[PDB]
């Protein structure tokens, strides 16, 4: 969280700003960013933009940062998600608009930090972001520069029955992930209230309030639910952190499969089977967690190599809220580095949605000058 003692100090850019840009940020852990000269003026932490006091605070600070740095925006950059407050405020402004994909923004926020301006391998892992195909993204591998992106790899889409409800009641997230193979998870599904289950299975079947997700956050939630870490959370990512803490020291992993069609896809349910088999055998949560973390590290590593082979690209960007996971970041940087990759991640801004606006700014800037 970048705030007192760091802000309102800007991010230095190599090339000077073509035209003044206001990046509105996203939803969770919001910051905004104003460009002028060699500086991107990212705001201090504002918070989740979903309430009146947050929004007012957000407004006032945009105006305050304008006065303090003599910036006058010529174009707004917003997230593609149509439901963010940051997006609506960007809609209401009488300025031209540049929409930027969430995870593209993540990858670019790290690129800005290292003054990169070339096609790179962008690994963006988080909970949610609106994708260009209308579905929820969060487990993406992209080939992108600051101008556009190509989507090369993701996890197989799973239903998220009830949307925000499944993010609180993560056993619902587990249900969506295991949906088309229910009978295998008999012991877990039998402990779901019969009435609610029937509703959930119908929600999935008839697509009522159910988004299809490719998401590292949700993957972790499903593991946490299946292996009895937590049925319900009090905040998004609670199960994620707890799963990281209880983990034991191990090199073991699970068997995964990379299917190639239009793009590289991995079925998470195939990994959940083995996870559940381990849990039913009475294996320690700590051991399972360790193995699961290594599985993610290993399949991301293998995916990096394949993409490098077909494209020639040697630079890897690691961003998205998932990389707040210390093990996941450290281990992945090393595995990739020891294999010849030039690996970059966030340091001046967060890998979480706090970094979004910096990425939004530099993408919108490349768009304008290009």
């Amino acid at each position: 969280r970048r705030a007192r003692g760091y802000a309102p100090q800007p991010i230095l850019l190599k090339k000077e700003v073509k035209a003044s840009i206001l990046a509105v940020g996203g939803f969770y852990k919001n910051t905004f960013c104003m460009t002028k000269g060699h500086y991107a003026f990212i705001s201090h932490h504002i918070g989740d933009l979903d309430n009146e006091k947050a929004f007012n605070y957000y407004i006032e600070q945009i105006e305050r940062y304008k006065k303090l740095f003599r910036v006058d925006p010529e174009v707004v950059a917003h997230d593609m998600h149509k439901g963010y407050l940051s997006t609506q405020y960007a809609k209401s402004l009488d300025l031209p608009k540049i929409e930027v994909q969430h995870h593209h923004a993540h990858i670019a926020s790290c690129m800005a930090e290292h003054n990169l301006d070339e096609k790179v391998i962008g690994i963006a892992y988080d909970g949610t972001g609106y994708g260009t195909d209308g579905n929820v993204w969060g487990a993406e591998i992209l080939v992108c520069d600051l101008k556009s992106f190509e989507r090369i790899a993701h996890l197989k889409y799973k239903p998220l029955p009830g949307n925000e409800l499944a993010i609180k009641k993560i056993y619902r997230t587990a249900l969506g992930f295991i949906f088309d193979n229910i009978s295998f998870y008999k012991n877990f599904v039998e402990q779901v209230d019969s009435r609610e289950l029937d509703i959930i299975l119908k929600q999935i079947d008839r697509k009522i309030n159910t988004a299809y997700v490719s998401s590292m956050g949700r993957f972790f939630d499903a593991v946490a639910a299946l292996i009895g870490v937590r049925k319900e959370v009090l905040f998004e990512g609670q199960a994620a952190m707890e799963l990281e803490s209880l983990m034991a020291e191990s090199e073991e992993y699970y068997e995964y499969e990379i299917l190639k069609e239009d793009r590289y896809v991995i079925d998470p349910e195939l990994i959940l089977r083995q996870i559940y088999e381990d849990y039913m055998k009475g294996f320690e949560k700590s051991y399972i967690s360790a193995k699961f973390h290594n599985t993610v590290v290993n399949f991301t590593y293998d995916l990096a190599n394949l993409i490098r082979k077909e494209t020639g690209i040697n630079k890897v960007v690691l961003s998205g809220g998932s990389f707040q996971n210390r093990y996941l970041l450290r281990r992945l940087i090393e595995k990739l580095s020891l294999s010849g990759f030039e690996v970059y991640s966030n340091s001046k801004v967060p890998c979480n949605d706090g970094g979004i606006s910096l990425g939004q700014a530099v993408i919108a800037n490349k768009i304008l000058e290009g």
Partner: protein, 305 residues
């Protein structure tokens, strides 16, 4: 989805369209509205497409503070659609019109090839006569005005979804479909003090509040513990991750009134058969924001569907 109503706005750009009203106000005197009904199933707990076709239009024609009088009915029917099913739909229509004190004065009937329509679509248009001193519009709201709702929120949306997708709950949910012209008439005793009337149909109460917000240039704060909901709907939503504010209503009206007259407006709603559950749910502010206060005062912004 709603990229279509956009094309509608730009090519039929005039003074009436841009106002985005429940019904056009013509000759400074009569209202005009149309609406299509495509609901499945055709027959559901607490009503049918027939009752719905009449009630929805009767209601929209009333929404400028007007008495509905004359309707049209157009039918698009699939070849081989059971005539016995059609008699029943049409009977419900004639009974609804009878209740609302309204007549079907013109119509049309089209038969199309099998697989060209799914059973039957109905369109109804309606005209009504404005009351004396009635100035009701989606633009009329102002900071200080009070927001009220006619009754329980979400009944129809959940009822139809429950019947269609065969969703089993502890308590079955019945549609609220009803003609409100009568309640509107008794509400229009306070003419000029009544500022906005709108039925929270497709898009729910949330959308209505956002439509008042955009068009009056105001914000709206509502309060959770004041929102009237049927227990079975509260629960249905809790099981599905659904906000009851997003659900369709067909027997409710959202009303915006002058602070001083708010109390009297609630009382006359409570004395009518379709407003016994009515409540004061919030007020109009100058914040240009649509917010909800949960228990213990948390000012979350209301999510647009």
């Amino acid at each position: 989805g709603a990229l279509i109503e956009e094309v509608f706005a730009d090519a039929f750009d005039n003074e009436y369209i841009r106002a985005m009203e429940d019904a056009a106000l013509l000759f400074g005197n009569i209202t005009l509205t149309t609406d299509s009904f495509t609901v499945k199933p055709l027959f559901f707990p607490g009503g049918d497409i027939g009752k719905l076709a009449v009630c929805g239009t009767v209601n929209d024609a009333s929404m400028r503070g007007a008495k509905p009088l004359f309707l049209t009915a157009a039918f698009i029917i699939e070849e081989g659609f059971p005539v016995e099913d059609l008699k029943k739909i049409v009977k419900s229509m004639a009974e609804a019109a009878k209740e609302a004190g309204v007549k079907i004065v013109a119509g049309d009937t089209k038969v199309v090839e099998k697989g060209s329509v799914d059973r039957i679509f109905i369109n109804t248009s309606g005209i009504g006569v404005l009351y004396e001193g009635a100035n009701v519009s989606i633009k009329n709201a102002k900071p200080g005005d009070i927001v009220l709702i006619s009754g329980t929120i979400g009944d129809h949306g959940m009822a139809v979804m429950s019947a269609r997708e065969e969703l089993q709950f502890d308590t079955p949910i019945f549609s609220d479909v009803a003609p409100l012209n009568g309640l509107i008439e008794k509400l229009m005793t306070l003419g000029e003090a009544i500022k906005v009337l709108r039925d929270p149909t497709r898009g729910g109460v949330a959308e209505v509040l956002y439509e008042i917000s955009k068009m009056s240039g105001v914000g709206i704060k509502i309060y959770e513990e004041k929102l009237p909901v049927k227990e079975s709907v509260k629960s249905a939503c809790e099981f599905m991750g659904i906000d009851f504010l997003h659900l369709a209503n067909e027997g409710k009206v959202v009303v915006v009134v002058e602070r001083d007259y708010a109390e009297k407006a609630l009382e006359i709603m409570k004395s009518h058969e379709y407003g016994k559950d009515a409540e004061i749910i919030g007020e109009v502010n100058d914040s240009k924001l649509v917010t909800i206060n949960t228990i213990y005062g948390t000012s979350r912004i209301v999510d647009r569907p």
